[PDB]
């Protein structure tokens, strides 16, 4: 017969806090998801998002061509854009009718879920023919870029990790792959013989999503926010939901 | 104060040789790339290339449909070619307006980087419905075809490995997957528990490339040569760059 | 755009006229009408894009060395061709020669 | 320490009134704009507006063809409408598939800013081949129509001047030019030798605007009102902002 918010017998309050805490902790458990998003920003203000969600580890790999703006059900200068690709793969190799394709991304943001271990993040940012570092012979196949990731924070809680980089120059023509491993502070190796086949199955079970939104507003409103995803906008504003020990 | 090319004090010469040797050896190290290319040759003289570059191991897998010629931004007889597929998947199963689709590859060449171990190469050359050997029940899922690979050589150095096969007959309608493992003469298993999650990450981090060139000339000039890739042309001519102990 | 004349010379263009037009190619003409409506008044259009890549990213004005730079005048208006927010408070030009 | 709206020490009030008065008076000064709009009303309810804003004097001149409805990015019966023009320029001179083109304006409204001197307004309302009065040989090139202009009033202030005329008959096929001169109650002639080159420059510097709105509602809401322009609607309702000595 106690009054709300006045004693330790407010079970609605306690259960609300536990409900949120359990979600925070489940995601961070070995049973939980790790997620990555790649955002490609185009000059027309639209944004391509690619997302993958999987247990244990997760990544995305795209070609130069795949990262170019594609407007579903509209004209895309498809023939001229084939010629653009040829001239990007080798200088003067194409016969395009344009100096700069507005379909090329102007910037990339990579975001991981807070369940990633940031020291496991690896990126292969290749040239337009998918070579990590000038020539295959001298290429390490990735860079460990975790130190560059900024914490996306809401109410003091890390809700995600962001690496943002611009591609403002004519020569910024890239292929891109990124990968991170789910946190595991235990000494149980999820890829040790006991569980390695489950990790192989996780590669099959990973769910992917891709869509082009017309505006960052639409991305924030209809993609980030409804799904309780983390995001950092072009104005450096953080989005996400803090859950640990919170009502 | 020594004269160029006349003593052991030609440091420009020594460093040039070391620079090239280091690239050769880095590629062959466990830190290095292994690469595969699949070339599909069409009757119009164009060539589809698919390339993947990754640490540890690498492969490509394509469907029958995926290997058919696609001309970006041009007509492709898309409806008739759906009917072609139906008649290829089962005899008399389609209603195509042609006896032979000129979109079917006439030949395939598989090339691996010299950092592959040739004894690890495996190929699954399936029928048009993606069965390795007539029926699933009697199929081994691959053949180890390394003994068939020819050494692509420049100046006495192996710059790559090639398996070329023609598809000259109406019945040569294939699905195709190929895989090789990076050399590892050490007794350190890159997939042992210590490193297995890095191999899982390598699957995410692998970069892919695909493009159709109008001619083998254009492939040699604008794809093989600029990237210091190995190649064997239809005239049996070898392309590539020898690097070990060379200026 | 170039004009050559004796005594004095100038050029005057609308917002629409300065947008990229690709002769003999597709130009998203309908969507670009909607772009214009949304540029003339906020939320006034129904365009399928946030930013039209047809909008100029920069302008350079060049005069021949036979101009008197102290006579140069520019009317850089908004998208509805008003020099300075509202007609009632607009001087119809700025003397920009010092720049 | 006085209370708002209770003394001569309400400086916010005084400055608000001066701010508005200054805008009213600046526009009417020789440094200010004079503006003209031509509205062409089509049977589908859409309205073409042409506006020009310039110092000293201002006008608009359009051909018969230019005043016809054009729907950007939609079909316009362009070939048939060429034939319509031929049959309008000379009776039975075309081969059109229609008796009356719905692209012809049904009415015209000319509006000047209140900074015009109404006695300077001149109109050349020509026939479809751009002759003011039947034949060039007997044409005065304009009519001084200022006496016909109605004052558009808001709160007792003239906010603009309107001349409205319908074109309800099949034979109302017009070319149209209008011109007015900015008020100048001084004895300083803005076109006297001292300033004549500035008037020549004003011809270059005049800004033009044209757009077709789908409805008079849209014109009122999104063109007239946001820009503090004067307007008189088909219901004889006046729009505009009174500024002289007003808060
Ligand atoms: N890897 C992690 N994952 C999730 N939460 C963490 C992690 N590391 C620390 N935290 C918790 O998140 C909160 C924020 O810690 P953090 O160190 O990020 O804050 P800070 O020191 O103010 O900012 P910064 O470290 O970026 O300068 C702390 O309450 C901490 O306990
Ligand atoms: N697996 C390998 N990878 C890279 N280089 C190798 C490999 N095996 C041998 N080599 C080196 O490459 C060079 C060529 O050796 P190879 O045995 O291919 O020549 P060959 O005997 O003339 O030709 P083949 O063996 O094809 O008849 C030698 O100098 C050798 O040391
Ligand atoms: N040419 C003008 N430009 C701007 N304001 C004017 C002009 N002539 C008069 N006014 C002012 O505008 C207000 C309206 O004057 P106006 O003579 O138009 O009113 P009215 O006599 O009620 O109407 P009308 O003259 O149309 O019958 C007056 O306060 C007057 O001082
Ligand atoms: N560098 C070149 C050379 C030729 N063309 C020709 O011009 C036409 C333009 O078409 P395309 O580039 O395909 O643009 P759209 O057809 O407008 O767009 P989409 O194909 O995406 O519908 C093509 O058919 C092609 O034959 C071209 O666009 N660019
Ligand atoms: N076996 C058949 C049966 C019918 N058609 C019809 O003929 C048309 C030919 O078009 P398609 O095969 O699609 O070739 P294109 O339109 O020229 O090429 P693309 O679709 O690649 O632009 C099709 O619309 C289809 O309705 C056909 O091509 N083949
Ligand atoms: N905001 C909107 C609403 C509708 N549409 C419709 O989608 C089609 C796209 O055509 P358009 O914008 O005119 O582009 P293109 O036809 O490709 O280019 P152009 O007209 O310059 O040849 C139009 O017919 C129009 O009916 C559109 O583009 N944009
Ligand atoms: N008096 C005539 C004679 C012939 N045609 C023919 O019929 C077609 C109708 O097209 P048009 O009048 O141009 O109308 P749309 O093509 O529908 O509109 P737009 O051209 O503005 O897209 C034309 O190609 C023209 O050859 C016509 O319209 N009117």
From Swiss-Prot, chain C:
Source species, domain of life: Viruses
Localization of this protein: Host cytoplasm
Glycosylation sites: 27, 36
Summary of the function given for this chain in its UniProt record: Major component of the virus occlusion bodies, which are large proteinaceous structures (polyhedra), that protect the virus from the outside environment for extended periods until they are ingested by insect larvae.
Leftover remarks: The sequence of strain H is shown.
Protein name: Polyhedrin
Residues of the full protein shown: 51 to 149 of 248
């Amino acid at each position: 017969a106690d009054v709300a918010g006045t004693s330790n017998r407010d079970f609605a309050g306690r259960e609300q806090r536990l409900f949120n805490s359990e979600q925070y902790n489940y995601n961070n458990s070995l049973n939980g998801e790790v997620s990555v998003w790649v955002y490609a920003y185009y000059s027309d203000g639209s944004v391509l998002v690619i997302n993958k969600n999987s247990q244990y580890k997760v990544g995305i790999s795209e070609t130069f061509k795949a990262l170019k703006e594609y407007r579903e059900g509209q004209h895309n200068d498809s023939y001229d854009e084939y010629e653009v690709n040829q001239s990007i793969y080798y200088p003067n190799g194409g016969d395009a009718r344009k100096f700069h394709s507005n379909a090329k991304p102007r910037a990339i943001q990579i975001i991981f879920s807070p369940s990633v271990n940031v020291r496991t993040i690896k990126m292969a940012k290749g040239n337009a023919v998918s070579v990590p570092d000038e020539y295959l012979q001298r290429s390490h196949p990735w860079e460990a870029t975790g130190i560059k990731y900024r914490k996306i924070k809401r109410d003091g809680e890390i809700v995600g990790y962001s690496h943002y980089f611009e591609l403002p120059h004519e020569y910024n023509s890239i292929s891109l792959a990124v990968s991170g491993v789910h946190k595991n502070p235990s000494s149980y190796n999820v890829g040790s013989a006991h569980n390695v086949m489950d990790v192989f199955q996780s590669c099959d079970l990973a769910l992917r999503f891709c869509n082009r939104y017309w505006a960052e507003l639409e991305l924030v409103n209809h993609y980030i926010s409804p799904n309780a995803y983390p995001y950092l906008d072009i104005n450096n504003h953080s989005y996400g939901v803090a859950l640990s020990n919170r009502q």
